[PDB]
DNA sequence: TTGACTCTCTTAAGAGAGTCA
DNA sequence: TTGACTCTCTTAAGAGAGTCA
């Protein structure tokens, strides 16, 4: 098995290689009407991406290290959290974008939490709006608001009450 | 079927049905310290479910009728707005359950939306405690709260700015 | 050891359609 | 005509593993 050093190796080698991938500043919504600035680190949109990445899905990457000739591989936002326990609540632990963009692997823009954890922060109204997230969110979430709703809740005769 | 007149044949067949279901009644909280009272008329869990009814999943159901001599099948929830647009926004709409209990068939607990919207609706604080749903939620969401996150943002390095 | 592709799977909110009696 | 079963599919947040040079 990898020993603790040999996982703080491949930790430090991700960070270097993502440290170098574009950054993209995203002006956002941070709730209660206030607006702040987020910086993405972007895997690039075609191969190549970088020292050890490969796409496996059209939004989808994989981190891959050969060690003692073991060739060993990560989904591509997992990485900082190898070191971490990797399930809660008899949950698996998930990557989570605080930013939102699924191609960033900025590590101060992710979070380690339940896949619920993780959805739900699509609809937070934001640090500034009301978040209630004990790791607090980064940004109001892209679906936060009044929805869409084409029809509401209404019945033809009398059989029922609410 | 085709004609509207058929359309709301089924319908009223589908509440007569639906409103001799077995009424439960769940208090359920509705944020901000308050809770509110559900009934729910919920299909049984075995057969028979009810004239029309059939279990085609473990929480999933369909109702049919047959008319000009063919036989024309829904989803047991999509009944009360087969006269409402089918899509919105180019996405499909879905039957959205307010009150969060899918064997419930109360059309007052039913809206009919985006799978965006209905999913958000299992976060939100709640008619008492800041929902903005346009079409109000009629409680809190049961996934509502602070999380459990394992490991927040972080990076080892220097590398990386917010 | 490495890159660039390939494939299928998980979850929990939702769906359509066929086989028998 | 009605009932009671069977199967796979959709979405958008996420995954693991194979092949070839
Ligand atoms: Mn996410
Ligand atoms: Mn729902
Ligand atoms: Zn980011
Ligand atoms: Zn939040
Ligand atoms: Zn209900
Ligand atoms: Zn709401």
Redesign the interface.
């Known amino acids: 098995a990898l020993t603790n050093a040999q996982i703080?190796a491949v930790?430090?080698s991700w960070?270097?290689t993502?440290?170098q991938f574009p950054v993209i500043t995203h002006h956002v919504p941070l709730g209660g009407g206030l607006q702040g600035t987020?910086?993405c680190?972007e895997i690039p949109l075609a191969a190549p991406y970088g020292v050890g990445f490969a796409k496996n899905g059209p939004t989808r990457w994989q981190y891959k290290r050969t060690i003692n000739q073991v060739v060993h591989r990560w989904g591509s936002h997992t990485v900082?959290?190898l070191l971490?326990?990797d399930n809660?609540?008899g949950k698996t632990?998930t990557a989570?974008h605080?930013c939102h963009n699924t191609r960033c692997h900025?590590?101060?823009?992710?979070?380690?939490?339940?896949l619920?954890?993780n959805?739900?922060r699509?609809?937070?109204?934001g640090p500034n709006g009301?978040c209630?997230?004990?790791?607090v969110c980064?940004r109001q979430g892209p679906?936060?608001?009044?929805?869409?709703?084409?029809?509401?809740?209404?019945?033809?005769?009398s059989?029922?009450?609410?």
Do not use: M
């Open positions: 703080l930790i430090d960070e270097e993502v440290g987020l910086h680190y900082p959290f971490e326990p809660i609540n632990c989570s605080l900025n590590p101060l823009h992710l979070c380690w939490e339940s619920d954890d959805k739900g699509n609809w937070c109204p009301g209630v997230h004990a790791v980064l679906l936060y608001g009044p929805g869409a709703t084409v029809a509401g809740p209404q019945q033809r005769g059989h029922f009450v609410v």
